[PDB]
């Protein structure tokens, strides 16, 4: 499932053991964006506008924590557009799904977002954003025509 | 006066060439932009794998 | 044949002009450079006053 969200996105959950769980659209205190992580600090500091404390020392015991498999997941090239035009949390893929089945899913929909007399500049700007990664030399050209 | 009569003719040829070229320019842009949108739909998209170490910034 | 003979005339004029210019260029450079060295010698030099505050950088 995919869902469009408002930028900037910051989430910081204080965990009970003293670490913090972070998911954020932007970097602070070295923490990478977009991928979530469990964060711990040796000394109290301010990050994302709030104080990450050093935890109290703990005594070790036998663990029963689960260890899930890792997983690599491919998404459609335009996933941000597909989530956007729905306005709701929408199913985009399955864990196992082939390249071909994944593509034939939104294609007819996406093709029917065609160029119109009323919003050509807006449409051209979206084409540039979509083309940027594929053909940078075409995206800069389309951007210039769009601002003209 | 022959130059004036010749000017009225040369003018109407450059005015005609002006419009025929605009017809071509717009017709080409609509073709290309639409094709590139088609191509953009079918390119391979991104991969995620939750690996923090891969996304470190120094 | 006539082209070779004519080429030989036009060539010798351009080759003559080429050298007469090089003579001038070198002769000018030596004049100007030596005068500028004279001028450089006679310009006012720096002032010192042991004031640390004057040489603060922020």
């Amino acid at each position: 499932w995919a869902e469009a969200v408002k930028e900037p996105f910051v989430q910081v959950n204080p965990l009970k053991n003293g670490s913090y769980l972070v998911l954020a659209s932007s970097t602070d205190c070295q923490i990478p964006p977009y991928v979530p992580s469990i964060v711990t600090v040796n000394e109290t500091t301010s990050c994302f506008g709030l104080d990450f404390k050093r935890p109290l020392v703990a005594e070790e015991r036998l663990s029963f924590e689960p260890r899930l498999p890792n997983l690599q997941l491919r998404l459609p090239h335009l996933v941000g557009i597909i989530a956007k035009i729905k306005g709701i949390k929408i199913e985009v893929t399955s864990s196992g799904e082939s390249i071909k089945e994944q593509i034939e899913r939104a294609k007819a929909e996406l093709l029917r977002l065609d160029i119109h007399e009323g919003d050509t500049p807006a449409w051209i700007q979206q084409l540039a954003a979509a083309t940027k990664d594929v053909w940078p030399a075409a995206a800069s050209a389309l951007q210039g025509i769009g601002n003209f | 006066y022959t130059c004036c009569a010749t000017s009225s003719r040369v003018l109407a040829w450059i005015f005609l060439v002006c419009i025929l070229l605009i017809i071509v320019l717009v017709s080409c842009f609509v073709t290309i932009s639409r094709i590139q949108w088609n191509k953009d739909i079918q390119v391979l998209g991104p991969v995620i794998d939750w690996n923090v170490t891969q996304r470190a910034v120094y | 044949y006539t082209c070779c003979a004519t080429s030989s005339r036009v060539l010798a004029w351009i080759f003559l002009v080429c050298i007469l210019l090089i003579i001038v260029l070198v002769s000018c450079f030596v004049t100007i450079s030596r005068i500028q060295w004279n001028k450089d010698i006679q310009v006012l030099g720096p002032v010192i006053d042991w004031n640390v505050t004057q040489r603060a950088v922020y």
Binding site: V35, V41 | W50 | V52, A56
Partner: peptide, 23 residues
């Protein structure tokens, strides 16, 4: 007289770990 503020280095240690599948 001249009074100045020289920056001096320091660090905090931050550790990070992954969450497979985001679970």
């Amino acid at each position: 007289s001249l009074r100045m503020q020289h920056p001096v280095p320091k660090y905090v240690e931050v550790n990070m770990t992954s969450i497979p599948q985001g679970v």
